[PDB]
Amino acid sequence: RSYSFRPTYGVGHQPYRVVVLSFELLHAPATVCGPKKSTNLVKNKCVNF
Amino acid sequence: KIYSKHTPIIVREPEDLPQGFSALEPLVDLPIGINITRFQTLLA
Amino acid sequence: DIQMTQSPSSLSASVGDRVTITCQASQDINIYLNWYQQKPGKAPKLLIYDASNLETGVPSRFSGSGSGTDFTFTINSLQPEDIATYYCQQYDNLPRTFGQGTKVEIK
Amino acid sequence: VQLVESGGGLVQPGGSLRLSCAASGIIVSSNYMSWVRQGPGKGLEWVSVIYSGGSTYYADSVKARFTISRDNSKNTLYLQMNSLRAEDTAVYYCAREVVGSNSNMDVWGQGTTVTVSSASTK
Lengths: 49, 44, 107, 122
Fold this sequence. Notes:
Chain C is mostly beta strands. Chain C contains no helices and 8 strands. Chain C has strands at residues 10-11, 21-23, 33-38, 63-66, 71-74, 85-90, 97-98, 102-104.
């Protein structure tokens, strides 16, 4: 059967696009991770690198 | 892990290898996680 | 819980007259709002599907329009064989509930 | 395609049995069924719905009472209650889905208007 997406209907029947996010933790290839905290550069003094 | 090396101008006849020292360098590292027991090459 | 209320409940004096009966609801609902035609002593029966269709064998004078939580129906023909009661129900929503009841009768 | 009723008589409060309604060849396991109350002094009242996936949805005021059973070959749906509080002076009509999108398969069934009270048959 088919959805009805006519503009005459209010909240509850109008289309709400949804995307499902689910991860896997059975195999361990150590891939897919996000970057963070890429700061500036410091020279000619003490450095906590 | 796939490591590669190429040597040009092999003037020796293509038999029983030449003589020489040639180190190898890392080329491709892959996190695939499968099993390997045997392999077969490709000829065209 | 969904509460449906209707003003034209008992049209006892509506004989040979234009009928403008209707059903509403508290929460706004779509066209999925059907009706029950319950004869005395027998199960309720459907004449209109999705507040906009018609049953296969019925007189063609019946026409119901439902849009924006307002289902309006008419019976211009006051046949004696349809001495019954009319009910209003909404579906495709949790939970399914029925109306409080309306009376239709010809003197 | 019609419906078969199993019921009748008078019962005291606190007693429950298997209310039974069958079809005339319609699929019973792989179909949608609904139960409603027809009672004197009031309109029709929604009771329960059972889907072909084995999921039952019914009112929260009658929770922990309804036990439904769809037989594979006998084609007769059973329903069992518990701890009747004497408000069952009505009849359980069994029905199908009224319309999915556009369908005229709308055969219904009847039953016996049973009562639950302290006074027995006299």
